[PDB]
Amino acid sequence: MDSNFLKYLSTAPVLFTVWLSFTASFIIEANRFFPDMLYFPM
Amino acid sequence: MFLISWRGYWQELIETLVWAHERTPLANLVRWKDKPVALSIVQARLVGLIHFTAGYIFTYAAFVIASTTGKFG
Amino acid sequence: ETLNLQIPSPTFEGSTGGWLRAAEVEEKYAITWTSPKEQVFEMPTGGAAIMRQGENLLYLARKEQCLALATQVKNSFKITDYKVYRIFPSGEVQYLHPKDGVFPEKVNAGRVGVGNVSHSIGKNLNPAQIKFTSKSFNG
Amino acid sequence: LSVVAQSKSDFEISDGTPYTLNVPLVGAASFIGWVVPTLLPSQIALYGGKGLSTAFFASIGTNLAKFPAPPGMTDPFWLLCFIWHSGLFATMILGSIGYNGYAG
Amino acid sequence: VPQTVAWSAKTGAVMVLSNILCIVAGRYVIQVKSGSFAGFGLPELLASTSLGHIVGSGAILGLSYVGVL
Amino acid sequence: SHSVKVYDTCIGCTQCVRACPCDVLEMVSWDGCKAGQIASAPRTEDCIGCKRCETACPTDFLSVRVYLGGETTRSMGLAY
Amino acid sequence: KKVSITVDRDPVATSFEKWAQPGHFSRTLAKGPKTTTWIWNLHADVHDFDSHTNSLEDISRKIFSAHFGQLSIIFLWLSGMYFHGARFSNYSAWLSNPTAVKPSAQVVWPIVGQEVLNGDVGGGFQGVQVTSGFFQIWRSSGITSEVELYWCALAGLIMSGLMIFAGWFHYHKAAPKLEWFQNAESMLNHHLSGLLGLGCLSWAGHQIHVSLPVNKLLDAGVAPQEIPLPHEFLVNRDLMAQLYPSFSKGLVPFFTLNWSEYSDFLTFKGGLNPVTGGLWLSDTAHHHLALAVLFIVAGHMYRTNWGIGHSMKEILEAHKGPFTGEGHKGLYEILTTSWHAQLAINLAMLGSVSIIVAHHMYAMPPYPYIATDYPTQLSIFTHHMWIGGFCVCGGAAHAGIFMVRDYNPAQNYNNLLDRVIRHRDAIISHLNWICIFLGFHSFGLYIHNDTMRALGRTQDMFSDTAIQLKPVFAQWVQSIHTLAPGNTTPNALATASYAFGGDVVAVGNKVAMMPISLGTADFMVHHIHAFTIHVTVLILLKGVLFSRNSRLIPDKANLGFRFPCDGPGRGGTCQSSAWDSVFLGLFWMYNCISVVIFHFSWKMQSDVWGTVQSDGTVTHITGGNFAQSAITINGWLRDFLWAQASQVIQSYGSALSAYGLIFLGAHFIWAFSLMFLFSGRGYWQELIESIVWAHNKLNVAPAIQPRALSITQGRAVGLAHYLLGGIGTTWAFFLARIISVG
Amino acid sequence: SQFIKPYNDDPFVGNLATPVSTSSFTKSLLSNLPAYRAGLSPLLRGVEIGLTHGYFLVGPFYKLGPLRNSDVALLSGFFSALGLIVILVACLTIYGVVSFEETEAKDQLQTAKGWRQFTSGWLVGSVGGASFAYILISNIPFLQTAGMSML
Ligand code: CLA
Ligand code: CLA
Ligand code: CLA
Ligand code: CLA
Ligand code: CLA
Ligand code: CLA
Ligand SMILES: CC1=CCCC(C)(C)[C@H]1/C=C/C(C)=C/C=C/C(C)=C/C=C/C=C(C)/C=C/C=C(C)/C=C/C1=C(C)CCCC1(C)C
Ligand SMILES: CC1=C(C/C=C(\C)CCC[C@H](C)CCC[C@H](C)CCCC(C)C)C(=O)c2ccccc2C1=O
Ligand SMILES: CC1=C(C/C=C(\C)CCC[C@H](C)CCC[C@H](C)CCCC(C)C)C(=O)c2ccccc2C1=O
Ligand code: SF4
């Protein structure tokens, strides 16, 4: 893959948008399979 | 108005008002002893702060007194 | 040296941006300059005027207006022949700029330094030290 | 009639420029020029079978008979007069432009 | 509804008149271009006949409106 | 008037003098720096307080310092 | 043939290299960041092409391809609106019962309980109710099925692909030269004739062959799947002559000028269709045909390649009189060499047109069943008032950018610009006096009324039951418009709009339109409107006229269009740039448009919208309280804001709870903006110093040194969050209120 | 032809010579107004201006004041107009004290003696014009209404 296109994908806004979309996305998935966790179950 | 808009806009308006007074007949017979200028930067901050604070006090005083009076409870 | 009051003014159609009663009762500024051409420039107080070939003369209310026009003529028409005067309602004419024939950004002999402080800015005196004292904070 | 089409009083539209306002000629010609086409009749309730100029003149007459009372909101007087005056002002403006400027 | 008429030679007469009127007017008033044999070309003819169909259509419809037909 | 001071850290770059819109500043001779010249403020009665001189100054802390003071017609920038 | 196509082939190489080099487009930013200001400066100046390049040719090429990029985004947006209507909507159920089903084309996923937003909109469907009026557009178009909505979505995607291809091609492969862009006569001829004229003519053809038969069958009562497909009207001329018998004669009446044959489908009815509460589509077809004719005629005015036509330069230079010097001389050169001058004009006109759209679409409801869909009427009026106000303020922003940058006094001697600049004090002082006179005698009437009602003196108020300020001129104009059918518009059958007077049009027992009477409250709020518009004009005009120089700063043009100040001297020159008058005029635009949309909402609920019970009596949403309560500020506070905020604040736990949350969130953002507006940069830089110290202590300081935002950026951030919060608060308030009650 | 020119031949003064500013008709009105008319003492200038202003002052107070619907409306309208005139005379007096230093000349408005004469004239004229308006309104029923007596 082009090294300049990869250098574009390494720019701060792209990484920030991708990383926070991935982060938001596994919060969403964790609340889909394990919803309403008001407490650590113990 | 004093907190958002700052001096340069107002000084340029006031210069157009100084021109209009000097050019209007029957009105340029009357002259200011003090040249009209826009408020200073710090003064405008103080005036906006006073207006903000006075409005804050008067609004809440009217509310806390009237709502408690009207309810009695 | 003195302002020749008879120098022809650059052609101009008038504007409301000119000087007001304070010029005729407190002070007025005048600027003269030589133009090699009959060319259009921008007035500091408004629209466009045409400077006449030969000697031009203007009247403005503020010194900054005369110098803003001077900066303009030098930058665009390369006219470095500009002399700025102050005129009082008594008729007294006061030459202003360049004050000794040489521009201020060029050094000149016989200029005495005013306002020069022998130490750096961090070496000034604290306000408490000079409270209720006439001593100046610049050391 | 500040100045008519003649060199009577030294009139000056501005500080130093004399200018002959042709108030007789322009006012008369604009009045007639607007009125003759305006006579064109129309079997519309606003006109009533007359032209705009004739209906406007008739409306002045009918409301002048009831002299203190003003014409009502639905009275045709207000529509007829506004259109007639708007056309008269426009033909006066255009007439003043044509005569004063083109001079012929 | 304003009254229009089926095409007759009268309609044609109005159209022909208007087209010729505009051809002569275009020889007079077109500022950028043998009264009709100097500098007369296809864009001038096509413009004067386009205005002829506009003036002619308006005249036909108006004369139908008022009763002249 | 406003009070304008020049401290002996001036490198004699003349930038303050060129940036001043009211011809307050000028260059005088001085052996302290390499350029052989220092800025001077002989005409502070004309200072309007714009602080364009301070903006122009490149020494770490400003060699030229404007201290806004009493207001006059000249220092208020009033054409009326 | 001096109008010709000229193109540079392969100008710019399609490379990813400059993608990897943020800031490549300017000499300042291309050397990399050293403070955080660089990051902000990168975004602030990026589409300012004439700040990066000197040549008008490269600027023009960048603009043409960016306009293709915008078109690609708009086509993608339209395609998504059609796809969500096709796939996630109750459109098919709404076609059967337009008066019972509420349009809904947005469905949420069930994640954190957010599926409560899928309310019961009707038609066996759950989703978010939509208010953009797309369903009524589609019914007016004659869509009648989700399959045709899928084909519209695909047509939008194909157009989106073609526009992004055209932008790439015309910047990187075949870029036109500057002499191509500087063809104003050709561009106007094609955009009047080709774009607008053939746009109207082609749409008129669709209305006649598809919209009219399909909507006649729908309004007759035929079920949508029982209606013939739109091409069977195109082919079976007998089936079309059943609905419209004039089609039996074909196109012979068109060509022979026997146009009164076509009165079946080209009508001049006026008024509204009683079944749908919308404009007669035969009228819209005739309207678009007539507009098409005179747009094609207008696009033949200007001279291109054959000697016929006008030169726009000659027209402009010939209009000069004795008051105005050289006249319009030099305006052609301005408008064919400055993009900012063109954008200033086109933005002011586009904003004005959007404001006209807002008034005309509520008063003469064009689509079937949009008049009684009250959430749509309020949404599209409010939306197009906000688009209009923003675009008008950008027209003054780009008039200032022109004056600061593209204006040259040498080429503008003694013409109209020179003369405006040379009496700008007389203009600004007279406008200033008008704004004072008009605030005193409009808002001061409200304060007089607050005081009199509070003091027990109701006989001393400006009201209908007291001292009356009647709008006689507006009432007279309404009278004329009701008298026009058969009188001054003799062949019209009904009035242009029932707002002027006349009948009550009811559809599904809800009022479509009915006369909007004007009283003392209407006199007062119309002068409020004139006051806020005059003040906004004052701020924006003062910024344009004093953009280059003042009595305060004689060389303002050397500082630029956007500078924060020129120091604390001369008493203080904070906010002296032309940018700062756009900044201050967007607040007053917000004030003006907020009062307009509040006036519309309260007046329509109080005096127009509602239900028609037996005997023809109408019960309005708020029961006619505008007349006696819109005359005081306490009336607006109590009977409009307080009374009607009940739905947003009680919305929690329902499908409208999203509006309750956005109401609160926008209150938050609005308040948060005041942190940036009332504050100064120096405080925040000194606070950042201590924060930087704590980072140095832990050896974690960044190499891009943090800075407080610039003075201008603090102002821009404050204004953006102010408008976002205030408009958002009204958006949530308007939508939850009218969805619950209308 | 050009209708706008520099003011009094001076291109750099802050004014323009426009038809509103400097036409023959405008010059005739300004020159003949009492403030600028030649041959008038400062006192007579004050009297003529005072009569005009006092006369129109009575009407708005009378028709729109708090006691407008009462039968004492004209008396209230006169007293309120007189009260305003008394305040305005004080405004004229304080202006004269600060603005002008004492000198022998008394023939011009912009002199301490002249301004005092203008104030004396304006006071008498305003009282006289307000009194005249009072007499006329008291006696003539057309003026008491807006002309509504005819309908
Ligand atoms: C253009 C306007 C528009 C808007 C505002 C929406 C809005 C929506 N759509 Mg619709 N849609 C549109 C157009 C639009 N659509 C078009 C044109 C189509 C046809 C293809 C569709 C087809 C469609 C379907 C089929 C569905 C939606 C759905 C949705 C909803 C959820 C979308 C979601 O969360 O996925 C998020 C999906 C992701 C993969 C997350 C991606 C996030 C990344 C990180 C964004 C990053 C952008 C990137 C960084 C840009 C830079 C590029 C890079 C090189 C630097 C939402 C209401 C869903 C719905 O309503 O379900 C009920 C649904 O199922 N849409
Ligand atoms: C008939 C000729 C014609 C037409 C239709 C247009 C149309 C347009 N031009 Mg113009 N243009 C023309 C001639 C024409 N131009 C000429 C001759 C010149 C040289 C002087 C220019 C120079 C020019 C510039 C410099 C710019 C435009 C822009 C635009 C767009 C304006 C934004 C808009 O409303 O688009 C939305 C409206 C639409 C209808 C979208 C339609 C998209 C296509 C391209 C329209 C035409 C399709 C096709 C002809 C129809 C086929 C019908 C078939 C199914 C039977 C629009 C696409 C601006 C723009 O956005 O550039 C992209 C712009 O900046 N044009
Ligand atoms: C155009 C709309 C509008 C606007 C701009 C205002 C503006 C104002 N109102 Mg008014 N008001 C309005 C409409 C409006 N009002 C309407 C329609 C009503 C109903 C009739 C009221 C009823 C009303 C009352 C009853 C009160 C105000 C107050 C205020 C003032 C707030 C001052 C301030 O800085 O907030 C500062 C804001 C706060 C201190 C708290 C904000 C209110 C929140 C919702 C409650 C508190 C939450 C909690 C304690 C804190 C959470 C902490 C956080 C960590 C999450 C200000 C004068 C109040 C006032 O004078 O303040 C002293 C006051 O008492 N207004
Ligand atoms: C409304 C009546 C009317 C109209 C339309 C015209 C129109 C014209 N006159 Mg005439 N004129 C009029 C009244 C009018 N005049 C009267 C009353 C007088 C006598 C005092 C004259 C005396 C006069 C002279 C002496 C001359 C003209 C000339 C001209 C021509 C160009 C100069 C001009 O005025 O530009 C006006 C330009 C236009 C009208 C075309 C521009 C198109 C726009 C849309 C203008 C529309 C303005 C307005 C809305 C139209 C109102 C119509 C109606 C409702 C009142 C133009 C054909 C000159 C000329 O060319 O000689 C033949 C010339 O020498 N006129
Ligand atoms: C940010 C910009 C923006 C956004 C998001 C919207 C969003 C919307 N608009 Mg609005 N609009 C805007 C700007 C915007 N508008 C501006 C600037 C104008 C003024 C020209 C309008 C005028 C407008 C009209 C007239 C209509 C909408 C409608 C709509 C809705 C349906 C969208 C659609 O399919 O259009 C569909 C649009 C149509 C089917 C008809 C459009 C007909 C106009 C006359 C086309 C003109 C195009 C032409 C090239 C523009 C020339 C401008 C002129 C000054 C030269 C939606 C709420 C429609 C609506 O309310 O539906 C309920 C609607 O009828 N808009
Ligand atoms: C056709 C419309 C149009 C066009 C092409 C332009 C084009 C331009 N404008 Mg103009 N402008 C417009 C409309 C337009 N503007 C309008 C409507 C306004 C009124 C607000 C202005 C006001 C304006 C000012 C005041 C200035 C410009 C400037 C500029 C230039 C720089 C653009 C740039 O780099 O910004 C980059 C773009 C951004 C940084 C985008 C961020 C903007 C906002 C805050 C984000 C949007 C918020 C979003 C919609 C909602 C978020 C949802 C939320 C809940 C999260 C460029 C030539 C600037 C300049 O210097 O020109 C020489 C300048 O100073 N314009
Ligand atoms: C009309 C018109 C048309 C065209 C446009 C326009 C020009 C703008 C407009 C003009 C409008 C305007 C602005 C018209 C303005 C008109 C005005 C204000 C006229 C004032 C008249 C004053 C009078 C008669 C005073 C009389 C006092 C007297 C007699 C003294 C009485 C007393 C004295 C001392 C002596 C003893 C007895 C008493 C009683 C005590
Ligand atoms: C409106 C406004 C003005 C114009 C305001 C002016 C000129 C104030 C003039 C006050 C008028 C003349 C009277 C109001 C005085 C008070 C109502 C009462 C004064 C008497 C008591 C205080 C004793 C500025 O000069 C200004 C300057 C810098 C930043 C913002 C602004 C600003 O917002
Ligand atoms: C808070 C504040 C700051 C400091 C504000 C800063 C440093 C902004 C903080 C941004 C941080 C670094 C990132 C957080 C951004 C948000 C999470 C979302 C931003 C969305 C856009 C930036 C994309 C100023 O610099 C300032 C200057 C002039 C007047 C008023 C103020 C002012 O009020
Ligand atoms: S700028 Fe600072 S350093 Fe350069 S000359 Fe003026 S004072 Fe000396």
Numbering used by the authors:
A (entry chain J): 1 to 42
B (entry chain B): 661 to 733
C (entry chain D): 3 to 141
D (entry chain O): 22 to 125
E (entry chain K): 10 to 42, 51 to 86
F (entry chain C): 2 to 81
G (entry chain A): 11 to 189, 192 to 754
H (entry chain L): 2 to 152
Manuscript text:
Photosynthetic cryptophytes are eukaryotic algae that utilize membrane-embedded chlorophyll a/c binding proteins (CACs) and lumen-localized phycobiliproteins (PBPs) as their light-harvesting antennae. Here, we solved four structures of cryptophyte PSI-CAC complexes purified from Rhodomonas salina (Rs) cells grown at L- and S-phase. The R. salina cells grown for six and 12 days (corresponding to L-phase and S-phase) were harvested, and utilized to isolate PSI-CAC complexes. We then solved four structures of PSI-CAC complexes purified from cells in both growth phases, containing either 14 or 11 CACs, and termed them as PSI-14CACL-phase and PSI-11CACL-phase for L-phase models, and PSI-14CACS-phase and PSI-11CACS-phase for S-phase models. Comparison of the four structures reveals how cryptophytes adjust their PSI antennae in response to the different growth state.
